[PDB]
Design a protein around this ligand. Sequence first.
Ligand code: C8E
Ligand code: C8E
Ligand code: C8E
Ligand code: C8E
Ligand code: C8E
Ligand code: C8E
Ligand code: MG
Ligand code: MG
Ligand code: MG
Lengths: 339, 339, 339
Amino acid sequence: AEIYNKDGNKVDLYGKAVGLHYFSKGGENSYGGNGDMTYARLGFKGETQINSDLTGYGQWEYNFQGNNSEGADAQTGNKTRLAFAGLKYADVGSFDYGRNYGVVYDALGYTDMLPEFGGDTAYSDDFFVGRVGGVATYRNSNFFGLVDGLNFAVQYLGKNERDTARRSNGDGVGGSISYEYEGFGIVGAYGAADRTNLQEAQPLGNGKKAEQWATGLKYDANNIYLAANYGETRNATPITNKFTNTSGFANKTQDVLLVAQYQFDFGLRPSIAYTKSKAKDVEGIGDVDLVNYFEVGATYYFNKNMSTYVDYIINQIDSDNKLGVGSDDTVAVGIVYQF
Amino acid sequence: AEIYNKDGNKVDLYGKAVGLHYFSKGGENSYGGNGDMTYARLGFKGETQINSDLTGYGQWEYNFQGNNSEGADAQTGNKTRLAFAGLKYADVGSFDYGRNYGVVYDALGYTDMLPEFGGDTAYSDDFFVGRVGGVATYRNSNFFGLVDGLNFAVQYLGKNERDTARRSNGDGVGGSISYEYEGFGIVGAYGAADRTNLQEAQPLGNGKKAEQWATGLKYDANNIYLAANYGETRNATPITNKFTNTSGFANKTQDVLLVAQYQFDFGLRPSIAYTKSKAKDVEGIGDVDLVNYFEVGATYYFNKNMSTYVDYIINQIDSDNKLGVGSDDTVAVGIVYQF
Amino acid sequence: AEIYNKDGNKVDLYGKAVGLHYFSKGGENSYGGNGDMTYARLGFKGETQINSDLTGYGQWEYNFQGNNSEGADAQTGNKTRLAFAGLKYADVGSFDYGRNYGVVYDALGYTDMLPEFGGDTAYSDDFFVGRVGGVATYRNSNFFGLVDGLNFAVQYLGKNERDTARRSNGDGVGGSISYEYEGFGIVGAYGAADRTNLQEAQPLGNGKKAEQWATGLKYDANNIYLAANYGETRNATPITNKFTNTSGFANKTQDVLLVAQYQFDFGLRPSIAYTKSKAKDVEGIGDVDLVNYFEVGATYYFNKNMSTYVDYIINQIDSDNKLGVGSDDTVAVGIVYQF
Ligand SMILES: CCCCCCCCOCCOCCOCCOCCO
Ligand SMILES: CCCCCCCCOCCOCCOCCOCCO
Ligand SMILES: CCCCCCCCOCCOCCOCCOCCO
Ligand SMILES: CCCCCCCCOCCOCCOCCOCCO
Ligand SMILES: CCCCCCCCOCCOCCOCCOCCO
Ligand SMILES: CCCCCCCCOCCOCCOCCOCCO
Ligand SMILES: [Mg+2]
Ligand SMILES: [Mg+2]
Ligand SMILES: [Mg+2]
């Protein structure tokens, strides 16, 4: 909500309270788990008009879990999601630095549209596919003002030598290009980065370089939303072998995501989707599915501040998955107040 | 403070900064402890008018301790207190889900009125008596609009299998009924729930079911506040034996709380109170008091945003308490800015 | 930003998003380190007009790091910086209690003006020189209204027996006096406190009392900022021997800080500075420098909401420093949105 707008500065303080519960049998062997998943969000987005051509901006967003006790586990799953500041100049472009979405999410965003689940390959702290720390991102809209609908971006990812391989990365560069015309959109994005010493020390994955790319097609008009993503990764998708209790990265993955939605005027937005991510040449295993499901769901929008939803994942992962990926279904039910 | 109210949505951003210090001799053997207890609160409460009969709402509230260093202990005692969203329909009722007050607090709230202390049996993460995660709560005001002053509630508590017995619970159901008429109020509340495997594994407490109930009587008018609570619990009140360093739950407790306060027009609000909670059939011990004190205190309200207070607990727990419950007095002094 | 002002209460909700990166060779052997240092701040400052002479106030401020992953390390470096409430009466003075700046910072603030670095001796949780918990502070402006420009303060520091010696303190008292006249300012501040048993148990440092004092001179007018601080400490400055992996406090330090800055009308604010802190009579070592550098930097202010800066520390610590204090240079580059 815009709570301040004076002397060329405006501040949006936003957030949401999400009452959320997951239903799965037993849910350790399931897609999403079982039990209370309630959380809240808080953030600010500010923008200052420096002069007629130049705007400055900043954003911070935090996740507060609502499914922890007030005891020792109080902080589990709490984190800053975004924290960056930048400048945008006329049609020249924008530049921001901090914790922000990786540039391959410019493609993966096309299918990251489900009521609760979906967007499975947009891992956090995973090079260019999700939110990540220490990215400098340059974006250009409408090719310097010269070509309506043609956008591009480049992103410089600085090394993050963390205490876990899962959350680390080396230096890298990625980019994206998109074109939009009368409801349709097409996008491509690619990034490559060094892997850290700790990452190369892991049992699963082999190589000095992580690579991720994705393409997207969408139709987004007349209350209809259809989208598809195809992508591949090298030494970039995090995996765990639940049998050996061993972790690392998949040598290769092939990822497909499809989504179809409709927005009724009375507020209901049904969703159907399909997601499959398959790993290849995993040490000790070979080829193995990481994600494989159909989705059926719906959101009901009471208005722009209140909604409820149900999201059902019909899991197609089989019970003898060689990595021990959960095979059972999950249903989420949520009630959302947002501002 | 209401900081946004536009297009059928309003947002209250609220909080407080509480400078607070406890004085006890030595305070490990005392009621409240000794030293700095400063903290702050931040929260939002939003409400959207969906149509003339239906409102949506959401609330989140956090506790930031102000008595930690900026080093390793920075997060001690920090937590989300509340996080829920809901809908309220005409006189049909309200329904919310998330982290919220347990329904037996509908009774215990009557005496939870002291300047700093009091409300001793309203434990957090303790089935139905305090704030707890994963509760679906239905509330009805004035019996569907048909009976002025008659309210009721039912609450479904979902299992929380946590890493400690203290903070866990099984599935349960509780409810409350209250009636208010010309200053007087009467309330009753009861809940029962499964205990988790981890809870049943503890040395103290025996049984597959936790139960809590409480009754309340109050007079709240003409600047006078008088209230009484009586309740009992089974396998629900958390206890520790400081001698064996053993923990669990009391097989039975019998709880009484009394409070008397007056609000002077010039701002002073004196308080006197009495609290006793006695445990029964504790393994290895038998009968033992958990809480036993008289309180004298006062709050001075400068206005609705600024207050100060003093709260003195005259502890009646004896020095040879079989569980090692502290026997010394505590005085709290606080200065509160709130918005 | 002031987001509420009604019925004698006003609330400022403020914060910033700081995209920040440090460049050093290798940065473990450097002044500041290497890599992403992005963070955000959020706070409130409220003030209520109780009557014509009396105001109540409260403030809370938090640091959210933006350079952590969303995994296990999510909370590293997160903390409450400030949390206090108080009253201010006409010209009689102000009194606040909670987590606030130590009173010797009344002097050290003079030189704590650099774009990113500087203020090296204003350690957090270090008696009277930085932010600290459990301080009751009385401040007087213009000597009860009788002497324009003459201010003073006294501060009572309550014992904080923490789990680390570094973050602990005993009871203490400190104070400050300052005089300002036509651009010039002079200040002196001194505090002494008991050391806790845990502090006295450390290998480095010897004595039952910590002492800190500092003097300051400044000129702050006509777009010019010049300032100098001189101070000394006893058993108060925290130190680590990186060779023995041993920690404690310096028996004595002698500290000097100099700063010179200019604010151009077009927005640029160049900075030059010098800082030296030398420890004396360190057990096993003798005399040893803790800080020794020249600084050159600049901030560019686009307006009151957006800035960028560069801060270069030309480190003069030598490579064979007996405590293993880093000897390499560091450059910070930042982009700041604030509200
Ligand atoms: C105003 C704040 C701006 C701070 C900028 C921080 C610089 C971020 O460093 C990014 C380093 O990335 C360089 C990429 O180097 C290429 C590495 O090779 C891997 C690609 O295949
Ligand atoms: C276990 C119960 C949870 C199941 C949720 C059911 C969701 C109800 O919505 C029905 C799905 O409707 C499919 C329509 O898909 C929209 C596709 O639109 C494309 C039209 O061009
Ligand atoms: C819109 C979000 C709503 C999500 C609802 C979550 C469902 C919560 O589950 C509560 C389960 O409680 C059922 C009670 O079962 C009785 C157990 O027996 C113990 C009582 O003696
Ligand atoms: C160690 C010092 C701390 C003690 C705090 C003293 C509190 C001062 O207030 C006096 C208490 O006054 C008792 C009045 O109780 C109100 C009962 O009103 C019922 C009238 O119907
Ligand atoms: C309205 C809240 C106010 C609460 C006040 C808390 C009291 C803080 O305690 C401070 C104790 O400091 C006393 C100083 O004693 C001197 C110790 O000797 C060391 C100095 O050389
Ligand atoms: C590695 C590159 C980083 C270096 C940053 C360069 C900073 C540019 O500013 C130039 C410094 O100018 C010095 C002026 O100092 C101001 C003193 O004013 C006193 C006048 O009375
Ligand atoms: Mg989503
Ligand atoms: Mg209370
Ligand atoms: Mg600074």
